Amino acid sequence: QVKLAVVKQVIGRTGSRGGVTQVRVEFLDDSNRSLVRNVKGAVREGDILSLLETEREARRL
Amino acid sequence: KLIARIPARRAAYSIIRFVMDAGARGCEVAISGKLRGARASTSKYKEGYMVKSGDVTKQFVTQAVGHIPMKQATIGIRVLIMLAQDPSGIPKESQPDVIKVHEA
Amino acid sequence: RIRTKTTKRAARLVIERFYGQLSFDFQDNKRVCDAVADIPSKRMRNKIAGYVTHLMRRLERGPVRGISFKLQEQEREKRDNWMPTTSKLNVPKILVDPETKEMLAAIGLGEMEGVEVF
Amino acid sequence: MEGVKLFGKYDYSDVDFSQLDPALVDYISVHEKQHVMVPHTAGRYVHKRFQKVSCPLVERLCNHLMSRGRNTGKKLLAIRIVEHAFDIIALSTGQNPIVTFVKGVQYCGAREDSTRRRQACDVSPLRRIDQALSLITEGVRKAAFRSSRNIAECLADELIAASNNDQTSYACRKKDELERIAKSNR
RNA sequence: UGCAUGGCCGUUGGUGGUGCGUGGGUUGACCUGUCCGUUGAUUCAGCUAACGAGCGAGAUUAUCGCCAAUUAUUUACUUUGCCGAAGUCCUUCGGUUAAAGUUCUAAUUGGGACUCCCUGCGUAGCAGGUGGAAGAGGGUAGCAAUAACAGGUCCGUGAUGCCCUUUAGAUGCUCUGGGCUGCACGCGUGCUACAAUGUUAGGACAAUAGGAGCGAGCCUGAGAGGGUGCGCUACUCUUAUAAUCCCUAACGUAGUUGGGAUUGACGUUUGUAAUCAGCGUCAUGAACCAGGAAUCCCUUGUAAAUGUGUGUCAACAACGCA
């Protein structure tokens, strides 16, 4: 319930209109693991993202 | 010349040779309007080199536009002539393109 | 913010002639390129001197392509000319492969005093 | 630089950012540099991307509450309204305004959104506190337009309920539509 | 007659392009030169049957921003000193060819910023950072190649070919009057609103222009307006104490003190003329509760709001350029 990632590295950008970034994240929960998630806005490395759902990675790269 | 029915080739390359031999870096000659055909068509005769842009046009490039009325139609005459800079002659300063390095 | 063909081709021609002047510092070399070359504007010399500095800290390193500054032309000639003592071509036994010995039979120059096989 | 207090009334000593939560707080912009006597300033904040963080947060509201087409400019108007919120906030509850303000900026801006099928992306903390201040102030003027009631009050009505997590609020109602749309599309 | 033309302008396209000398390839149209990274850029870097010269780009010009030299006591100011008025023991005003100047003001000559500096990434360069008035073409403009569009203009011209008009009861020119302003309706650019982040009443900082026409001060009238005409051939005198904003009141969610269209009359200015011009006054008090499908402009002192000049002009801006 409301889990907390943090951005290791910005791989690049994506979407049809270039609207969204996507990012490698390491969980701040501390369980550990790396999740590749599409964020909406603009993201500086080391930023913290709250995810309703920790499961599912985005698609491809 | 062109009142007295010389071809336009020969009329231009009269003066365009006379300009360059006298002392100038380039010149252009345009003879716009109606020779031969029903449509008007543009001659342009050029030699040397001829700077068209910037401030440096205004300092270097002399030019003069005119027209000849005839029996048939109204031609336009137009002659652009570029100069060399003198050392304090009658332009002084060189172009902003060029620079000169001294010998060792 | 790229340097054009005129300001590069000047700045190489400056270092050609006057490497005896100049330094790593910009504010020095700016004031040199007034005296060395008659230039119309102020902005020109700041961009010429800006590449003259750039090439200096490339030159503090292996020799840059398409540029020759008279001190290295003298230094290359000394580095060129001398040649070490001894031929360096004498083993002097000289090893030779089995088939290449049978060639040196067929020429008519076996018993050369140069050794064989392994 | 000893008191250092907003409108010459409130103080930033309080506001316990560490206390408020994890994440979110960073793009909050209430960290010392941000504090100022008056939220008015000569902004140079739109020059390079993330410079909006380094401005004060109370200013960033006063800019949002500058619409539409008649109220453009006139910031010097808006910082009266946000003053006369922060009296109504402080003297009703007895909390000071800045604590109960930043709790409103937390819980408005929804995590997730439909990126145009449509797919549900996550958000940056920058884009959360942006779309906090929009969906507060959108609700304020939409309420205050035609309503026989001063907008300083209609800000203060919106701003209290944003902290306590009620569906009175135009902010915190509109996130639960937008967040559920992201959950549906997915 | 712009489909006979000159010039001038818009546009394709202000994008990065265009094509010569000698050499090579091809029977030839023609190609090569003019091709794996970088830049706004055929910008550089380097490949290489091409090598070398151009033009456009860049440079340059103009201005805005930061500097300190050079001048200025009758065209800008400041400080100090004098003589005033109030305060009434030291504060604020106004004046002064009166001594010193230059921070504001005015404008000439120069300085200044180059990816120079550091760290990452990939030599060309790129991203961030320090400092700095200013940092990545410092911002904004101006100028802008070759090659064309039967795009526009014979209603700009003593620029013009040909056609017809000069049968003067003229298509020449001019006087009186009327049109281009006529309205069942359809589209384009704009303006003012639909209010309370408001309107009403009272109180409290600009810049750029222009001016032998601007028009000072003081009288007259509710108001518009009217009379008298001081200064200025202008950084001197003048249009000229701008408006959103700000601070005290009034109103109260209503087609309402929101909105100000359309109509009736009186009071006037400009003009040979007000019949379709503008201003004032009192009345009249409409449609409009944020606008369907659609579409436009915009990245920083920008959008949006908010006024002021100027062009046309006797008088009239909801328009253009600033």
Highlighted features:
part of a larger assembly, 4 chains, B: 104 residues, alpha+beta, Ribosomal protein S3 C-terminal domain, four-stranded antiparallel sheet, 5 strands, elongated, C: 118 residues, mainly alpha, Diphtheria Toxin Repressor, domain 2, 5 helices, rod-shaped, RNA-binding
Description of the structure:
This is part of a larger assembly, with chains A (about 60 residues), B (about 100 residues), C (about 120 residues) and D (about 190 residues). Helices cover about 0% and strands about 50% of the residues of chain A. Chain A has about 60 residues and is mainly β. Chain A has a four-stranded antiparallel β-sheet with strand order 3-2-1-4, with no helix packed on it. Chain B has a single domain (about 1-105), classed as Ribosomal protein S3 C-terminal domain (2-Layer Sandwich). Helix content of chain B is about 20%, strand content about 25%. Chain B contains two helices and five strands. In chain B, a hairpin with a 7-residue loop joins strand 1 and strand 2 (about 40-45). Chain C is mostly helical and about 120 residues long. Chain C has a domain at about 1-60: Orthogonal Bundle (Diphtheria Toxin Repressor, domain 2). Chain C is about 55% helix and about 0% strand. Chain C has five helices and one strand, in the order ααβααα. Chain C has helices spanning about 5-15, 25-35, 40-60, 70-80, 100-105; one strand spanning about 35-40. Chain D has a single domain (about 1-185), classed as Ribosomal Protein S7 (Orthogonal Bundle). Chain D has helices at about 15-20, 55-65, 75-95, 95-105, 125-145, 150-165, 170-185, and strands at about 5, 10, 115, 120. Chain D has a two-stranded antiparallel sheet with strand order 1-2. A two-stranded antiparallel sheet of chain D has the order 3-4. Chain D starts with a strand and ends with a helix. Classes of the chains: A mainly beta (about 60), B alpha+beta (about 100), C mainly alpha (about 120), D mainly alpha (about 190). The interface of B and C includes residues 93, 95, 96, 99 and 102 of B. The structure holds one RNA strand of 322 nucleotides.
